[PDB]
Write a protein that binds this ligand. Structure first.
Ligand SMILES: [Zn+2]
Ligand SMILES: [Zn+2]
Ligand SMILES: [Zn+2]
Ligand SMILES: [Zn+2]
Lengths: 144, 140
């Protein structure tokens, strides 16, 4: 039955998701060994220099966790801190040269993940795609 | 071109957020008076269906024999299960309602998916299934 496939499919999503913090397909191809969360922060910092707080929000984790992750990245020479223009208590984090290709690769990993969903969707007709879109909206509601 | 790829992405993200930090996906909160981990209750459910070994549970849950050893130890000190001689494990009467609540929990979850899947016509339902199998292939 459909309910059974839905159930199994979700289970499959989790066996895949242990232990990552996010779903990316294919292999990270970055030469620097870091966690998805670490690389992700680097990617966020490339799109926009940021505070501990803005990051906590984007990633949806404790500031305390962010602080831990940033200190590690700072020690690994992947990020550097600086003060804000007007307010000097505001601490801003940005990429170093070392991190630029790493941010770049992770963004790409995101792009390839999206491309895959996209090519999967495109094996369906325009109208097929619209049924699948309503299924996902419906299913998305149960988990809110 | 279209929203579907971003939509699949957000959706997997939603599953991610909902399933932190649980062993499985159930809808609604657990209704048992005794507060166990989901893995522990599911272990009770499993014994009811069939008395089992450490080995079999590890396979069925895809966790390490060591974790299974830990869980059973917890359930045993709370007198929810009893051993026997390969060591075979089974429920005590005290856990029978706990297994029942957990088996029912799954059942309410399933049904919630059935009613959702039923808002769709027969041939649309086959579209979804086909989409699901294709997406499943991406995570294997
Ligand atoms: Zn990467
Ligand atoms: Zn990422
Ligand atoms: Zn329960
Ligand atoms: Zn269960």
């Amino acid at each position: 039955s459909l309910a059974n496939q839905i159930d199994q499919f979700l289970g499959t999503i989790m066996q895949f998701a242990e232990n990552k913090h996010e779903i990316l397909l294919g292999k990270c191809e970055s030469d620097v060994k870091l966690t998805s969360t670490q690389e992700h922060i680097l990617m966020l910092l490339a799109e926009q220099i940021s505070t501990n707080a803005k990051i906590a929000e984007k990633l949806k984790i404790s500031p305390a966790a962010v602080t831990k992750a940033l200190k590690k990245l700072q020690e690994q020479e992947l990020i550097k801190s600086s003060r804000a223009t007007n307010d000097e208590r505001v601490v801003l984090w940005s990429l170093t040269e070392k991190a630029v290709p790493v941010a770049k690769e992770h963004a790409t990993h995101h792009e390839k993940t999206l491309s895959t969903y996209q090519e999967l969707g495109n094996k369906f007709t325009d109208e097929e795609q619209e049924v699948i879109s309503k299924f996902l909206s419906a299913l998305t509601e149960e988990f809110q």
